Enzyme design. Sequence first.
Site, PDB file in Angstrom:
ATOM      1  N   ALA A 244      11.574  52.479  86.666  1.00 49.33           N
ATOM      2  CA  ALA A 244      10.279  53.148  86.731  1.00 49.33           C
ATOM      3  C   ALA A 244      10.094  54.153  85.594  1.00 49.33           C
ATOM      4  O   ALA A 244       8.986  54.269  85.073  1.00 49.33           O
ATOM      5  CB  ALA A 244      10.090  53.829  88.081  1.00 49.33           C
TER       6      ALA A 244
ATOM      7  N   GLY B 145      12.673  54.558  82.832  1.00 52.80           N
ATOM      8  CA  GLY B 145      13.555  54.283  81.703  1.00 52.80           C
ATOM      9  C   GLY B 145      14.250  52.939  81.756  1.00 52.80           C
ATOM     10  O   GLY B 145      14.223  52.267  82.786  1.00 52.80           O
TER      11      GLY B 145
ATOM     12  N   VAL C 157      17.639  50.344  81.540  1.00 51.22           N
ATOM     13  CA  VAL C 157      18.995  50.337  82.079  1.00 51.22           C
ATOM     14  C   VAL C 157      19.913  49.503  81.206  1.00 51.22           C
ATOM     15  O   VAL C 157      19.668  48.313  81.014  1.00 51.22           O
ATOM     16  CB  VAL C 157      19.069  49.931  83.596  1.00 51.22           C
ATOM     17  CG1 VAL C 157      20.403  50.361  84.206  1.00 51.22           C
ATOM     18  CG2 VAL C 157      17.909  50.523  84.401  1.00 51.22           C
TER      19      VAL C 157
ATOM     20  N   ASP D 155       9.537  51.732  96.144  1.00 58.49           N
ATOM     21  CA  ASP D 155       9.437  50.628  95.195  1.00 58.49           C
ATOM     22  C   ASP D 155      10.438  49.491  95.489  1.00 58.49           C
ATOM     23  O   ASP D 155      11.173  49.032  94.597  1.00 58.49           O
ATOM     24  CB  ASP D 155       9.513  51.121  93.744  1.00 58.49           C
ATOM     25  CG  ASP D 155       8.679  50.303  92.759  1.00 58.49           C
ATOM     26  OD1 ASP D 155       7.904  49.428  93.211  1.00 58.49           O
ATOM     27  OD2 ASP D 155       8.776  50.559  91.542  1.00 58.49           O
TER      28      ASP D 155
HETATM   29  N1  LIG Z   1      15.938  50.613  87.654  1.00 63.32           N
HETATM   30  C1  LIG Z   1      17.149  51.100  87.909  1.00 63.32           C
HETATM   31  N2  LIG Z   1      17.521  52.290  88.263  1.00 63.32           N
HETATM   32  N3  LIG Z   1      18.914  52.229  88.379  1.00 63.32           N
HETATM   33  C2  LIG Z   1      19.247  51.019  88.099  1.00 63.32           C
HETATM   34  C3  LIG Z   1      20.509  50.357  88.112  1.00 63.32           C
HETATM   35  C4  LIG Z   1      21.690  50.874  88.583  1.00 63.32           C
HETATM   36  N4  LIG Z   1      22.664  49.904  88.590  1.00 63.32           N
HETATM   37  C5  LIG Z   1      22.125  48.747  88.098  1.00 63.32           C
HETATM   38  N5  LIG Z   1      22.776  47.582  87.964  1.00 63.32           N
HETATM   39  C6  LIG Z   1      22.026  46.556  87.518  1.00 63.32           C
HETATM   40  C7  LIG Z   1      20.670  46.645  87.195  1.00 63.32           C
HETATM   41  C8  LIG Z   1      19.886  45.462  86.738  1.00 63.32           C
HETATM   42  C9  LIG Z   1      18.574  45.205  87.055  1.00 63.32           C
HETATM   43  N6  LIG Z   1      18.157  44.051  86.449  1.00 63.32           N
HETATM   44  C10 LIG Z   1      19.194  43.521  85.713  1.00 63.32           C
HETATM   45  C11 LIG Z   1      19.253  42.366  84.935  1.00 63.32           C
HETATM   46  C12 LIG Z   1      20.452  42.057  84.297  1.00 63.32           C
HETATM   47  C13 LIG Z   1      21.560  42.885  84.430  1.00 63.32           C
HETATM   48  C14 LIG Z   1      21.499  44.041  85.210  1.00 63.32           C
HETATM   49  C15 LIG Z   1      20.308  44.371  85.862  1.00 63.32           C
HETATM   50  C16 LIG Z   1      20.043  47.884  87.327  1.00 63.32           C
HETATM   51  C17 LIG Z   1      20.778  48.973  87.787  1.00 63.32           C
HETATM   52  O1  LIG Z   1      18.186  50.237  87.788  1.00 63.32           O
END
Ligand SMILES: Nc1nnc(-c2c[nH]c3ncc(-c4c[nH]c5ccccc45)cc23)o1
Length: 307
Positions: free
Chosen positions: A65, A67, A69, A170
């Site tokens: 939302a 930034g 990742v 969300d």
């Molecule tokens: N919006 C947000 N706030 N904290 C996180 C977060 C914490 N640990 C996570 N581990 C994976 C992913 C992730 C999302 N789509 C992906 C597609 C490919 C690989 C990895 C991912 C995102 C996170 O995400």
Amino acid sequence: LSSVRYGTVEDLLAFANHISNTPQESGILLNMVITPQNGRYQIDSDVLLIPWKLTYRNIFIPRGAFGKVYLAQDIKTKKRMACKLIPVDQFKPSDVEIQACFRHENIAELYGAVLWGETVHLFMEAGEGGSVLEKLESCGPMREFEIIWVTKHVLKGLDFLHSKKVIHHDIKPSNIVFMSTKAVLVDFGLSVQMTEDVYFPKDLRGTEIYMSPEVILCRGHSTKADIYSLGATLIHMQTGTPPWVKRYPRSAYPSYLYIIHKQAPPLEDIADDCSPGMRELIEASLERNPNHRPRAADLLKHEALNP
Ligand SMILES: Nc1nnc(-c2c[nH]c3ncc(-c4c[nH]c5ccccc45)cc23)o1
């Protein structure tokens, strides 16, 4: 605070509040998986930002939302962690407050927060298998057993959050991530801690496709808002396409606010290949009246998610 050091939840919370209220990097670490070196924690020296590697053949940096990742690796421990980069101007303390104060197997763990330049770096538990969205985008509709397995983990996370009066705000495929033995909830940037039985919104929060009619109205809502979002997530998982998209494609007018308010629940979007148990679970999740909508605790008792 002029350095990166190990600290308490209170230290982290005080640090996060000081950022949102405006040289060398500074921060608080809650877990020894991150190794500061002489009060420093620099990219390319103490931590490496490595690429996310998804194993799908058909189809990357996910967007939260507030930034992007990235995948990070601590040089000393070799621990792989998610690293969300948030511009200070967009930093909401809830992006750390929920994960720092509350601990559950189905809620992503917070390892530490580091401020450098005008960017907040959030080190968290990594979902290396990606999110439910990438699985849907590459494999199409999910098999019933996969939906049951994911729903059960999401529901335990929501049951825990809602017990603590936390509205995620969300719930959607991109915010449910795959880990080796579990599915976990991520992104608490839009989450709120309720103090009353009804939460009165200041703004309109969430992803429109998964948004409940009471959130769209802005007249007050509760934890039940997440239950409807889960129902909309379930339609996307079962059909491979988000609700509203096939019946009402967006071109000249990108908003779904009017459609959802007049036509929700999107029951017509449940596929014909859906089992009676799964259908009952999705239909109850999407209930228009939030007072009649079941709690996460109630949905866990459903026949569709039990032998
Ligand atoms: N919006 C947000 N706030 N904290 C996180 C977060 C914490 N640990 C996570 N581990 C994976 C992913 C992730 C999302 N789509 C992906 C597609 C490919 C690989 C990895 C991912 C995102 C996170 O995400």
